[PDB]
Amino acid sequence: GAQVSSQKVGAHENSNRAYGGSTINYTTINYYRDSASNAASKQDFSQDPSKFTEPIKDVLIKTAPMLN
């Protein structure tokens, strides 16, 4: 029950028949029934900051006057 995922490669070795290029993957297998035992996957999501940067009721159009 292996999970195979890709690595985001930073420094690439001089190689494209083994390392740097042809997508380098890594493998994870969970050994425990409790998910709290799992390592962190770090495959995380981002979001728009608007709930903090623009919490105003009427939409902000930046080219327009904020007050109108």
Ligand X SMILES: *C(=O)CCCCCCCCCCCCC
Residues that bind another protein (CB under 8 A): 1-6, 8, 10-15, 17-20, 22, 25, 29-40, 42-47, 49, 51-56, 60, 62-67
Which residue bears the tokens 């425990």?
32
**CA dist list (Å): 29 to 26, 32, 36, 37, 48:** 10, 9, 14, 12, 32
Among 16, 28, 38, 50, binds ligand X (CB under 6 A): 28
From the list another protein, a copy of itself, ligand X, none, partner contacted by residue 7 (C-beta under 5 to 8 A by kind): a copy of itself
From the list ligand X, a copy of itself, another protein, none, partner contacted by residue 56 (C-beta under 5 to 8 A by kind): another protein
- Taking the C-alpha atoms of residue 29 and residue 50, their distance in angstroms, rounded to an integer, is 37
Question: Positive or negative, the Cα torsion across 11, 41, 39, 23?
Answer: negative
Minimum distance between the CB of residue 44 and a copy of itself, rounded to whole angstroms? 4
